[PDB]
Design a protein around this ligand. Sequence first.
Ligand SMILES: *[C@@H]1O[C@H](CO)[C@@H](O)[C@H](O)[C@H]1NC(C)=O
Ligand SMILES: *[C@@H]1O[C@H](CO)[C@@H](O)[C@H](O)[C@H]1NC(C)=O
Length: 299
Amino acid sequence: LSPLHPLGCNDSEVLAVAGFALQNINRDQKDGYMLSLNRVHDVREHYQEDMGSLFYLTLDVLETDCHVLSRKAQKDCKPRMFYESVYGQCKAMFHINKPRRVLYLPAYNCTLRPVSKRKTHTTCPDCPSPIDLSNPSALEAATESLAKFNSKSPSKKYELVKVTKAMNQWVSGPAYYVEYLIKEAPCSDSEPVGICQGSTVQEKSVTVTCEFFESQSSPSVTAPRGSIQHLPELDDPEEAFPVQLDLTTNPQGDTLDVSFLYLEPGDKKLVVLPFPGKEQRSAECPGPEKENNPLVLPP
Ligand SMILES: *[C@@H]1O[C@H](CO)[C@@H](O)[C@H](O)[C@H]1NC(C)=O
Ligand SMILES: *[C@@H]1O[C@H](CO)[C@@H](O)[C@H](O)[C@H]1NC(C)=O
């Protein structure tokens, strides 16, 4: 819109604010895996001269192998390898006010898809393959791996919560690799306490390892309402990952009260517009991709 000024997707301020917004998104999640920033696809800034700025960000993201509940650092979590890749886009409306040292993510939304199995097969026909999380063999691997893990826990026993990842490959026979969350068995409540990796091969041979969540803080404070949705593969560009982020459908613009961020009690209102479309985009957008390793890139 008229007050929405486009910015270059490679600008330091833009990339820093994008990092803040994405770590806020990750903190706001309690399901799935931590997202990683590949680049800023587009960015518009609404400057408001004492209420700071509001950035309308379009982000190209990749799923890592860290579960969000691990709360690990962005630098201990790398994008998944290409045959199990999950990618898409997030839109975020991020508010920053430098003189007052205020950060806030009033709204976001992400749309992700797993990489097309056809493209994977084209580039690596013998690679491991993701499978449905409800696959009987995946559920069996989870069950038996957790059974073994409990067998070697004298006092504490754990129960399955949900399979979060499943994969099939050939290791001198059919093999299934799964990840799943575990909770403490009633003996404390029914909340995820860790994530386990389970495996079956070939009368099956079983392996199991578990990681328990610990506390973890970084340059990002709060992240209200938003959602991450997972759509199916592309059977076969722009609008491959449709994302709606409309706090207001009013071209006039609405006002959002953010007084809780500032020391004074009242009269701190932020102008919000409908999220800007792809036209009037800076020639420096989209920015340069950070992942150039084809071992982690989607086609
Ligand atoms: C992006 O900015 C960095 C400096 O932070 C520069 O080294 C790099 O060449 C830029 N890439 C562009 C403009 O594509
Ligand atoms: C975020 O996406 C959901 C659909 O997954 C949609 O219902 C919701 O309105 C979106 N949020 C905004 C602020 O538009």
